[PDB]
Amino acid sequence: KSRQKELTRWLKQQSVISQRWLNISRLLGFVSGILIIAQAWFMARILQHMIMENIPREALLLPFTLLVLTFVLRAWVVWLRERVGYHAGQHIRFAIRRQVLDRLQQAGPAWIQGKPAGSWATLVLEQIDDMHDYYARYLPQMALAVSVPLLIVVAIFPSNWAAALILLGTAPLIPLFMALVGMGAADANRRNFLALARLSGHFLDRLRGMETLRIFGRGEAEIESIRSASEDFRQRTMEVLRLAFLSSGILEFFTSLSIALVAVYFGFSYLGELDFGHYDTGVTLAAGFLALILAPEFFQPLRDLGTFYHAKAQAVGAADSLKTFMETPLAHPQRGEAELASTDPVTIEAEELFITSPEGKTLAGPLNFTLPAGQRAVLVGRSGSGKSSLLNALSGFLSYQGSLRINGIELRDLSPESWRKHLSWVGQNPQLPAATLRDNVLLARPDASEQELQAALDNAWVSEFLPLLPQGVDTPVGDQAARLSVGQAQRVAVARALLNPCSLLLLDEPAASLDAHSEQRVMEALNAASLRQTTLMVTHQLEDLADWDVIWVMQDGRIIEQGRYAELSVAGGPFATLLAHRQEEI
Amino acid sequence: MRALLPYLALYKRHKWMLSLGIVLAIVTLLASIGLLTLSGWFLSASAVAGVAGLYSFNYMLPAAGVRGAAITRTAGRYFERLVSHDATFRVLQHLRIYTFSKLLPLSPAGLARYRQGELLNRVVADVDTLDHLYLRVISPLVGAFVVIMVVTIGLSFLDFTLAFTLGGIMLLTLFLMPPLFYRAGKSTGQNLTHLRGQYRQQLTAWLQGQAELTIFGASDRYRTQLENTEIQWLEAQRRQSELTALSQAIMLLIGALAVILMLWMASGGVGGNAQPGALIALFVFCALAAFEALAPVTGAFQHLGQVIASAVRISDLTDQKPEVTFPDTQTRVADRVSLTLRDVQFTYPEQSQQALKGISLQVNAGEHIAILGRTGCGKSTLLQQLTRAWDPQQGEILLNDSPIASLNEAALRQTISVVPQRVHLFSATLRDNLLLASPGSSDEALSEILRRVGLEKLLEDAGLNSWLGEGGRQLSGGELRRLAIARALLHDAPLVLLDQPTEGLDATTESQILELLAEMMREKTVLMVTHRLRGLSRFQQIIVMDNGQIIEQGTHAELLARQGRYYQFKQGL
Numbered sequence A: 001k002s003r004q005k006e007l008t009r010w011l012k013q014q015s016v017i018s019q020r021w022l023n024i025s026r027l028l029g030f031v032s033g034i035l036i037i038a039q040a041w042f043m044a045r046i047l048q049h050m051i052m053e054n055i056p057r058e059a060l061l062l063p064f065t066l067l068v069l070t071f072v073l074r075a076w077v078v079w080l081r082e083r084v085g086y087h088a089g090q091h092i093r094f095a096i097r098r099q100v101l102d103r104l105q106q107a108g109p110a111w112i113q114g115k116p117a118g119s120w121a122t123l124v125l126e127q128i129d130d131m132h133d134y135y136a137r138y139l140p141q142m143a144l145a146v147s148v149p150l151l152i153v154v155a156i157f158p159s160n161w162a163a164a165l166i167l168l169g170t171a172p173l174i175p176l177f178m179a180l181v182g183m184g185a186a187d188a189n190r191r192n193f194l195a196l197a198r199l200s201g202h203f204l205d206r207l208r209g210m211e212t213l214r215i216f217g218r219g220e221a222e223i224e225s226i227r228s229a230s231e232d233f234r235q236r237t238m239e240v241l242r243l244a245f246l247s248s249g250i251l252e253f254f255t256s257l258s259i260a261l262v263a264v265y266f267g268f269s270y271l272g273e274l275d276f277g278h279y280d281t282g283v284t285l286a287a288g289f290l291a292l293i294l295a296p297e298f299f300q301p302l303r304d305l306g307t308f309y310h311a312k313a314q315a316v317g318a319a320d321s322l323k324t325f326m327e328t329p330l331a332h333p334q335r336g337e338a339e340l341a342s343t344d345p346v347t348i349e350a351e352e353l354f355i356t357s358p359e360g361k362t363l364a365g366p367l368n369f370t371l372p373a374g375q376r377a378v379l380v381g382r383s384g385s386g387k388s389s390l391l392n393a394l395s396g397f398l399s400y401q402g403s404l405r406i407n408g409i410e411l412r413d414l415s416p417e418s419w420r421k422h423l424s425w426v427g428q429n430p431q432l433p434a435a436t437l438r439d440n441v442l443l444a445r446p447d448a449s450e451q452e453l454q455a456a457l458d459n460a461w462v463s464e465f466l467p468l469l470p471q472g473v474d475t476p477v478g479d480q481a482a483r484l485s486v487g488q489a490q491r492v493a494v495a496r497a498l499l500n501p502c503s504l505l506l507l508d509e510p511a512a513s514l515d516a517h518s519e520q521r522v523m524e525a526l527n528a529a530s531l532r533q534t535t536l537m538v539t540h541q542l543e544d545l546a547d548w549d550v551i552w553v554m555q556d557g558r559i560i561e562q563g564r565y566a567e568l569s570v571a572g573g574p575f576a577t578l579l580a581h582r583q584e585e586i
Numbered sequence B: 001m002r003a004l005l006p007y008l009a010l011y012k013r014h015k016w017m018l019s020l021g022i023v024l025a026i027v028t029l030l031a032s033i034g035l036l037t038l039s040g041w042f043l044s045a046s047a048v049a050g051v052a053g054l055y056s057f058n059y060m061l062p063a064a065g066v067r068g069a070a071i072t073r074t075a076g077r078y079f080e081r082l083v084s085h086d087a088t089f090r091v092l093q094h095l096r097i098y099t100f101s102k103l104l105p106l107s108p109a110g111l112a113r114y115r116q117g118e119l120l121n122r123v124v125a126d127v128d129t130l131d132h133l134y135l136r137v138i139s140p141l142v143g144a145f146v147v148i149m150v151v152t153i154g155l156s157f158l159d160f161t162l163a164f165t166l167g168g169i170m171l172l173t174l175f176l177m178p179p180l181f182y183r184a185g186k187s188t189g190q191n192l193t194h195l196r197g198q199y200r201q202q203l204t205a206w207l208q209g210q211a212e213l214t215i216f217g218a219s220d221r222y223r224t225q226l227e228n229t230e231i232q233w234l235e236a237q238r239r240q241s242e243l244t245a246l247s248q249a250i251m252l253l254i255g256a257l258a259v260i261l262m263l264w265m266a267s268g269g270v271g272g273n274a275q276p277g278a279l280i281a282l283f284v285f286c287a288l289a290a291f292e293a294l295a296p297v298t299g300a301f302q303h304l305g306q307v308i309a310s311a312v313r314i315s316d317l318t319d320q321k322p323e324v325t326f327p328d329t330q331t332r333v334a335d336r337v338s339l340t341l342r343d344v345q346f347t348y349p350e351q352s353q354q355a356l357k358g359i360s361l362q363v364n365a366g367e368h369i370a371i372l373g374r375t376g377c378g379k380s381t382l383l384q385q386l387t388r389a390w391d392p393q394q395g396e397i398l399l400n401d402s403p404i405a406s407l408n409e410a411a412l413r414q415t416i417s418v419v420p421q422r423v424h425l426f427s428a429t430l431r432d433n434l435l436l437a438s439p440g441s442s443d444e445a446l447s448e449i450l451r452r453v454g455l456e457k458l459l460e461d462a463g464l465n466s467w468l469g470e471g472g473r474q475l476s477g478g479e480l481r482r483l484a485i486a487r488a489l490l491h492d493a494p495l496v497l498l499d500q501p502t503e504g505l506d507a508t509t510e511s512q513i514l515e516l517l518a519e520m521m522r523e524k525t526v527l528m529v530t531h532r533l534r535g536l537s538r539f540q541q542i543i544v545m546d547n548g549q550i551i552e553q554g555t556h557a558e559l560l561a562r563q564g565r566y567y568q569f570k571q572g573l
Ligand code: HEB
Pocket: A189, A190, A192, A193, A196, A237, A241, A244, A245, A247, A248, A306, A307, A308, A309, A310, B085, B088, B089, B092, B131, B132, B135, B136
């Protein structure tokens, strides 16, 4: 059909989460349609008494008291309707944010890594909150545009069938005109809303790359680029907005004709020119003020719906991305139920192993390695080899189509919640996720004796830089480990890995781009830590792999070499070439 | 409101389209009020006149008013939307250019105040908020005040006391209510930013650290406090929404106080007359339609808090002092540049050395240099001074025996072609990621360079029209370093700086680039900064230095015989 209607269909399907709140909001929009009529009937009966019969105001207190009562009731319903309206939108946002975090939690960390985490917080914060005004204001109002206009003519029809036909006559003509040619451009508006967002990613791109613009002297020639890009957008948009605003104008025309025709018909009816509309009875003045007061209230729900246009347009854009997020097919690692009997070092073996990304793309080709229990193997190779894909597969973050048997038990059959307890990982980036450094280290087990926590801090060389921090061990870590440096951020990650007994330890480039002194400190901890259990380290620091008993070299996703450091150094194979390349860097 | 002054002064350009879109807003709102006030009178006048006064009524004049006040209500609304949207896109274009023109002179320095990933996204979202000052704040407020005054002035010819009691009520709620609901919802507005920025903190930590939480088992207990912050956040959103629902009821009560007063007080004398007759309906129906202009004024005032909040954020960055100034002189760029450094620092003082003096290396007119320094000792910060990111404080840089500060900006950019460590794709056509370097170049001159550098792959499909950057087709590290070199070749400059080429690149590509550096820039003096001892034989006058000081110096052949620190760098560790 149309991308415009297949999102509105999606946006209507999410509203079921809170169909109760959207029914009180529809009901109160029907009470408010009655209180308007009671408001107008009293005002017409008040006005007729003091205009025709010349009754003094002091005699008119029963209608005035009931008129004030009706005005208070409308303000109560309006106050009620916009608090029921909020709940209609919150209980949907709260349940779609749960449908997004789950889908992101259910998907592995490798999936998350595809997009920057500042773009995942756009989907979760700024693009789910954009859908509030659609369910809190646009959906309750689109039901107020049928509740009141129908209820207005039904109230006027007893009084006068002509003034009830001037209003109702324009009831079908508007939705036709807003759909005869306006709908052709409403989707064309959704394409402009995408261009305006893409134009603000073109301004951002210029801002991000000002350093490159400066050095090449394109500072003043990329201002004309901003001008041309902002002029094409404006020119393209107003070829569309020249038609999209007819709906605003036309609706403002049928509400001007209807108030004009009501005034002219009643005006001439009083003068005797027109003698048909009434029910064969004199047209009372209050029969003309009833229709005239309600004539602008007939079109008021539709004119307030134009005010909420951007409520829909910023939710259709938000539903554009959310829908394609819950609809993209993701391959998840297979979850089994078996669990390891013992906490002894595991034995890893593979037979024609293929590691695949969430989108089915193969990351690591056929692997036939085999790692006996307690043996510290090393994964080396050029960037893009897929060495990390192997350390992520053993963690259960990636799905494989081969055989990867831990202690003979296939990794698919292993229930992760029990397998991850026999695992520890350091990784290239520390990524501490807690607030206090003391709880960053204790993330392995929440409660440990101070003997254990101190043992981790000293063994990982965290104790030597606590005084440098202001509050010491209990120092806050802040946004992305800002308070402390990367050199000693990695050292906190090591202390987190050494805190619990482990059966398999994975170390994916620990010294990578690390401070020179803190690089030696971590190596000293891990080289001593890797001896106690089956270890698998990824590194490019090839000059000190002498002690590690097995070395695998990965090229193009497949292991192409094996053996200890002593014989690979002189073998002249791929490792020697890699060793030669590393020896140059100082 | 004082912060907005630099950005109101941007309205002087396009001050007719902006004011026309406020004039049409008033005219639409007065035809809306006039049509219902004239209709209310016409029914009351004709009914009081009755059948007898048909011939003495002169209905022809109102029929011209009804036609007049209904054409301007429709055309006024259609053109108040077009003009105020056209005017909104011009000011957005003028804010984008002004923000870019101010941030440009301080691009490398000053702008490094925090993680630029977030800084540059809250400047894009702040220019878009300064773009709402016209339609979302200024237009509903200025439009409502003129409509209040025009009604009060025009409605005072009948009864002065009745006009000022309606205008007075409307003028109080224009001036007393928006500043009073803003004050009531200022405390929750604070509690709503402290939680929204705390949910993004906990979410980003929970998403990024998702590998470190599933392994250690805390992915479900660090999502519970995440879900706990959303609940407090949503509750604070309910209170703020429980306040907008109050300004929507009070507006419906004030608009009801005015109707009641006009029914009551105009029941007595309207002006001199003691029984007004048709004049009662004229006042009442004017109080009914008048408060349509006051609908957006409340919400148009809390959105003034957001716009002012963003008018200090932009004024914080744009109105910063650049550290570099350029003489406004015209000079010719030479074809032979002999860079000469004297007593200029190579690295910011680290580990409180307090003794690092400036190096004094000299570069011949056409001889390649290779500064080889230890990695992790300190930042290189040598290309910054040559490209004048900030004027050096230690000594003087002399470029072709003329001070570099004495060189014009357009000429300095033409005498130095630098390839940085961080290459940038401008999310445009591959043609325009190379027209960057040379503004005027035949489209074939590019394509020969691409193969000439080794980029025939990019020419395999849709060559020079392919989308790069964020729109797709991100280039790999080896693919990317070749693009930066491609730019420098087009931007023919006598002196070529290379911040750190062949970094993070494999041996097959490393030997590919280094040879490409050798013949290609034979005539063009280079100054290559690196920490890799690869292919330096083709270079001459190698500058090996550690901890901010020169230890030795000479040709690669000379160093090996010298048996200095460079020799130690060559054999073992
Ligand atoms: C995409 C395309 C587009 C765009 C881009 C835009 C962009 C914009 N916008 Fe718009 N709108 C539109 C389309 C649009 N739009 C429409 C269609 C409408 C309709 C409404 C009615 O109907 O009335 C509006 C309407 C509107 C309004 C009014 C509403 C009521 O009624 O109340 C406003 C205020 C605005 C603002 C604005 C802004 C600020 C901006 C930024 C620039 N907006």
